[PDB]
Amino acid sequence: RVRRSEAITHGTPFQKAAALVDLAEDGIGLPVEILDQSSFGESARYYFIFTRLDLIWSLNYFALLFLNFFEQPLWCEKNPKPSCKDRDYYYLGELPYLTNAESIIYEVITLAILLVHTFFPISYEGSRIFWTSRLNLVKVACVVILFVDVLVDFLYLFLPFRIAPYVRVIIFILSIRELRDTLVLLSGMLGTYLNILALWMLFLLFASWIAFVMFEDTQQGLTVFTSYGATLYQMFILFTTSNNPDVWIPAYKSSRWSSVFFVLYVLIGVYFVTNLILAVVYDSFKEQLAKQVSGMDQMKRRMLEKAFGLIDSDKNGEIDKNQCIKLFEQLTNYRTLPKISKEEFGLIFDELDDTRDFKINKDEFADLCQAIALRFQKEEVPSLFEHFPQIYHSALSQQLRAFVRSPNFGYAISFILIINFIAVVVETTLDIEESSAQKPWQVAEFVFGWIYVLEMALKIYTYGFENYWREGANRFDFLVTWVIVIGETATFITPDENTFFSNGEWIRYLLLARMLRLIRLLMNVQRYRAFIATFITLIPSLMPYLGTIFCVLCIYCSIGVQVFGGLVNAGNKKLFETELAEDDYLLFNFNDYPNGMVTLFNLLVMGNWQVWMESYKDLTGTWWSITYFVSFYVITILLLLNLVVAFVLEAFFTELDLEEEEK
Template sequence: MSESNLLLPTLSCHERAAWIVDETTRGAPIPNAQSIPRTRLSRDRYLFVENTRYVRQLAVIALILLSFFELPSYCSPHRQCVAVDGTSASLSLSGVPYISPLPQFLFNIFLLAILIFFFIYDTLYLPGTALHIHPKRLSLLFSALVLDAVYVIAFAGYPPFRLAPFLRALLPLFYFHSLRECTTAILAVLNPFFDVVTIVALFTFIFGWIVTLVFHDVPEADRYFGNLVTGLYSAFTSLTTADWPMQIMAVLDVSRPSALLFLAFILIGVLMLFNVLLAVVYNAYTGHMEDLVVRKLQDRRYSLGLAYDVLTEQDGVVTLPDVRLLFDELRKNKKHSHMDDQQTQLLFTALDRDGDETISRDEFLGIVDALQLRFVLELENVSPVERFFPSFYHTEGWQNVAKYVRSKSFSYVIDMVMIVNVLVVLLESTMDLREKDTPKSVLIFAAIECGFSFVYILEMVAKTASQGFDRYWRDYGNRFDFAVTWLLLAGAIYALYPYTENDRTIVRYLVLLRCLRLFTLFAKMPRFRKLVQVFTVLVPASAPLFSFFFLSLYVFTAAGVEMFGGLIYRNNPALNPDNNQLVDAFVGNDYWTLNFNDMAAGWYTLFSSVIVAYLTEIAEAIAATSRFGSWTKWFFILNFVVNSLIVSNCVLAFVVDLFVMQDEDDEDELILSDLQGRYGSKRVKILHRYSTAEEVYRTMFRDRVNEVLSKDD
């Protein structure tokens, strides 16, 4: 039976318009108004699925993390996991405790049941506006995950191969919209990237072939250039600067002029070709993001145009009561639950650019951007002194005190106190590092810190008394000062108790806590404040990129555990430098904890390799112990190409773009100033929140965006 034949309450135009706005802010613009169901029951079902999205996302994250606690496939009841000293142990080298097979199975099934329940609910009850993308692919993925769980149980929790980690890596692409867009952007980099990589590979091959041809019969160079395969690999590691300059040292005593050949190789390869790679990745990634931003903006404007048409079906105009009814429905979505009546009034004023008390179609198209604004209504200066002691508040003496507390002179005095406090902290930490501190010195420093804490408390009391607690607490810097001050006082009082040797660790933590006051001082410096603003934007906006980086390493780690798990331990004869000189660096540097004996250790190993570009020690150790021999080095080369050259450069491109955007943010400041001017005497402060990479790039490509908007108009 169709939904239209059911005797159910229908949605008003405001509720249907709110549904379209919800979908648009979710990143799924509506292609036509007819695709939105018209019954209240469908809307309630939609809100249930949408408001529980975090449950599904947490379940996906939990499934990913579960892989780090599962027994590796090389483990069995007869062969427990290998510890770093070659003995059997129930804990991995990373120190992460493994989950036994039965709890692992139950936890896995429980998380899958949550995801499958919402998937079936969404598919059955919201077929026209399903919140899951590519339902057929997702159903196949769920089927594979369930079969894998049964497969693990069939082997009593010790399967010979684990497929689940690879399947789980696909789940975030279905449940995190921003991660899916990030993946698409990185894939767009591949074609131009491989064009340049081909040139780099050819250049490396020619150099490795020439050097091997010249030095293959030199005994000192046999380790690096004894044959063509070894020579090509040494040329590659030279290009990554791993082990440099060991490769050149092997031939330098034989031929001093050969240094010029290596110098030319490094200059051309590292300083030119690798920077060309960076430029190609930067241009391709930024270009794709520009096209994506423009395309999504066009889709958004079309979808919001549909919402406006639905909203004006009856009266043909949108007024403040219409906006209030719209937000009454939007507030049912947790994303917009913070929009109270006062915020709705402020947002209406922000949308009403011409001040005619109605919202035109063009003005309504900016509602998604307006929802990104945070309105802060400045409070009146009502201090507790004025409230409880009005006669004293109006005296000339108190007014002078309050004026001084709000002046820069008072701030300078507190800054000087903090500088002295920092010097005391440096003196105390120096005595601790040199082990010259005594119980008496600890008590003295604790007493001094109590004095500083009381000064900071007096500062808080003075600010609260002069401007009121509400205004004081609204400033996040004041909240930070408040928390640190009371923690410092509590720590100092604790240290004043009878001193014991067990208190040494507490005192060290107290010293670190005191250093937090430095941030208050730095926050007053314009340069530092600008840097903090960049990081407040960088952290949420770059989350998809860093999530992709984590998942990329996760997939490589899962493959590494399957192929190389249990190979690295101290008593392994293949890792004896007397038998294989290629592993002497691994053994000599005590790299035993860098291995693939479990997921956590393997992920850290690959992360360390990416940070330093390439770790030849790990590659040689795995090659010496693996049944695949030297072919295993291709695993590490592929990890270098994907994570060091592609993903890391995409992260670098975004960070560079973000700093450029912050430097060119003057136009946004003018726009916000214009908005604040519409509120007259209400003293409304408007803050723009850049919470996604798309919003960052919209600001960067403002000229292109404005060009698109003008064409659409």
């Protein structure tokens, strides 16, 4: 019944120790310098008043990234002979470019929020240690670069290019803990990664030399492997199996036996070498992962040990039973424990140890804290609505709480979901058949959204906002319910022909999202339990690595927009000779940021990727351009995708071990 932050700011040393150990078991780590302070009153107060506003900081950071995502392309700022307003001419569109006034206003708001956030910690942390930390200095450097950039931009209304996007992506990276940990792992693994890159480059060079010397006199060498450089380029492309039969079709036409060589080369390359590369990364990742968790454990224990130092003023490493009983009484509130009588506890103690005045030392106290936390679940907060006692204690209210806490509500919700499936599938069937009876079924579907929002309100009322928010799936359900209700009220408030809301089809998809929870029932069977559990666990766990890949994609998009900005034009004559026009890929150019992101995603999956490389090589006229693409393939596909594969495998194995250790 005591708030954790209120426990930190004021309370007995026993209350402070209980709250600190609860924080340790939660996993949150307080800043180190705050622990060193004596009772850290003002610093803790400021720290929690800062932490209370985390959502605002995260929203500001996402808005800052979307500012990059929405910025006008630089090449359009330079005067083009046809205006940049013509969307169809440059094969770009479907997002509005911010005007100068709106752009500067949005940037000023974002920069102000970022500045106040990054300079808040100086109030509580202290000047000297704040200036000591390297993270503070790099963040200050990023924010001052942003400030000078926006200042020179405002005064402008010469720079060869705009440096803001990279800086803001970097500061967005430094914002999040998980992204920082991922970068630490990557920096650890790069050292052993480069050696495998060197071996792979040596193998490619040797194979390319063999192929070039073998096919020089033949017609296929005259057609494709004209020189050693082109031979190495084609061999590197073939190593990815992007164009297997295309590169050596003339050799196969000239002589059938030649294919054997290529059959010999692809097999040893794709199956022996590539997998080996993955293996290397795999091992390294595992090792680095261990290091990280080890450090985390140490840090936790360190802060945990502070509690042992906090409870004892004389700090002689002496713990007394009459002193520890207060700690147990404090923890039984935070974590549920069986009711223990004082006489019962005394009998347990004196039968447990024959020696009089037995002492619990620091290490076993730390171990038993972990043991009691792991064995017993946490105790939920009573309520945030508890301030009104009459409504809480009302007979109908307690009957409703008893009803909802029973699983019968769960079976009722599952039955509603099944009826929802029947209704949505029949409505979609009628839509496919283009019958006129779709509207009543759509109106009935609206009632299901009403039922969902009502049940969500009931659950959040009975459990409490924090208890409801604690469950991971509950957050997704809450977001889905709120977006459904927003769409519903937007449609109902205005009886006008909207482009999207008037049709009303969208609602069905939202229901489908809410219905993914049925897949959870499939966890019941033994055959698919491990697969379903691993798939569910991956979604929150795999987020930092996907975010790192996304931010690398953003950096590469920012790089590509400047170099390949205006090359793809409708009036350009050289473009139609390239394969982009032949295959109708012009929509995936690098003209603006969203198109760059889409084409980078397409390059990421290795689906017909060499067409962009050689098309842009022909368009630019310089070989060095391919470096960009080549660099990309080295950075994200061989390293980051293999990292994702390794993480998925490790998660699956840990899930299997956890499943098997139950029996």
